């Protein structure tokens, strides 16, 4: 009946159209800050000296960018890992030139996303559910942490975090391959397996359930109207689906336990994306993909190239050209 | 920027034509029930 207890009750209420919760109390403002700053920087921010070499890169629409090329540009290499809030700048003019908004956006977003994952725990508890949906979302979350926070920490500069834009993303990928040979790293290969397999099993499961829908409708109506929200009976025949799939391959390569199946569906891409987030996060400390450059040589010692050496030729061309003005000494050590 | 000038009409019709189509179908669905 007391003021605080009433507030606590609204915060944690399961009647709010959108659940708030204690994690929401941090999430709502941090995401709003990040979103507003991003929308405005994407449209109107002046160019940013990402690499600290007084060579501003234009990222916003009003400075000659389209949707594909635009980006909020990472903060200056001259700042490195230093905290650069607005109030640390002599002016907004300075803060804009040096990449201030990237830092504001990504810190608020990492906080708000972290709270997003907590909020998934919290509502699950209020509704009497099992709790581990938030564990599934920790795979995408870890991946964002890796490219916005972990990789900058290991390389010493937010200027090497991932730009918030479409082409910026591709720039990050090409530079990453040249320096870490990420294609040749097992954790990236597992990530592709998690993501290709995720797409595969998505299609499989959707096709098998769709294939064994029980006839409930006429040909003139969407079969979707054969299911009513909250009906107790299943809407497909799982034994017919098992009977099809077990014969398509062989019997014991098919699930007939729906719980094991759906757990499988959860586990495969989650685990694969954990590894690929861990791959980024460990190449942050320069433990790179396998190097087989010149591993094969002949009886005399001539190098016999393999596909790995051809990769390396590509990698070199990415190496020698990236940040073409930023390097004064012969090794790009970070 | 020196963009293709028909890009604007391309984009406007690309949005407008199929959207209008969907709206026509939805509204006449609602006046049925």
């Amino acid at each position: 009946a007391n003021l605080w207890e009433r507030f606590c009750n609204w915060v944690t209420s399961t009647d709010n159209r959108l659940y708030v919760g204690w994690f929401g109390v941090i999430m709502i403002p941090t995401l709003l800050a990040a979103t507003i700053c991003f929308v405005i920087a994407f449209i109107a921010a002046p160019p940013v000296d990402i690499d600290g070499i007084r060579e501003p890169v234009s990222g916003s629409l009003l400075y000659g960018n389209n949707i594909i090329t635009g980006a909020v540009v990472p903060s200056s290499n001259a700042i490195g890992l230093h905290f650069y809030p607005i109030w640390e700048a002599a002016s907004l003019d300075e803060w804009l030139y040096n990449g201030g908004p990237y830092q504001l956006i990504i810190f608020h977003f990492l906080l708000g996303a972290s709270c997003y994952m907590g909020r998934q725990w919290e509502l699950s508890y209020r509704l009497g559910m099992r709790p581990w949906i938030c564990v599934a979302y920790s795979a995408p979350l870890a991946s964002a942490f890796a490219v916005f926070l972990i990789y900058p920490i290991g390389q010493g500069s937010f200027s090497d975090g991932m730009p918030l834009g479409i082409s910026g993303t591709f720039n990050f990928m090409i530079v990453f391959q040249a320096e870490h040979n990420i294609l040749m790293h097992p954790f990236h290969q597992l990530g592709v397996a998690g993501v290709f397999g995720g797409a595969l099993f998505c299609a499989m499961h959707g096709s098998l359930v769709t294939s064994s829908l029980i006839r409930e409708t006429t040909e003139t109506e969407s079969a979707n109207y054969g299911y009513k929200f909250g009906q107790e009976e299943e809407t497909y025949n799982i034994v017919a689906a098992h009977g099809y799939f077990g014969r398509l391959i062989f019997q014991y390569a098919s699930f007939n336990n729906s719980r094991s199946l759906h757990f499988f569906l959860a586990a495969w891409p989650v685990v694969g994306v954990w590894f690929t987030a861990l791959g980024i996060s460990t190449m942050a400390f320069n433990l790179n993909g396998f190097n087989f450059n010149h591993s094969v040589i002949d009886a005399k010692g001539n190098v016999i190239n393999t596909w790995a050496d051809i990769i390396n030729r590509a990698n070199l061309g990415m190496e020698v050209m990236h940040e073409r003005n930023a390097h004064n000494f012969p090794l790009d050590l970070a | 920027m020196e963009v293709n000038q028909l890009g604007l009409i391309a984009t406007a019709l690309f949005v407008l034509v199929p959207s209008v189509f969907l709206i026509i179908l939805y509204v006449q669905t609602e006046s049925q029930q």
Binding site: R17, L61, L62, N66, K228, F229, G230 | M1, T11, V15
Partner: peptide
Amino acid sequence: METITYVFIFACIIALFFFAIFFREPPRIT
């Protein structure tokens, strides 16, 4: 004109979000 077009579309998507959430067909049980 291209900036206006890009922002116009983006803004239509945010408005659609509002309607899809607050003005959805409510799910009713059985």
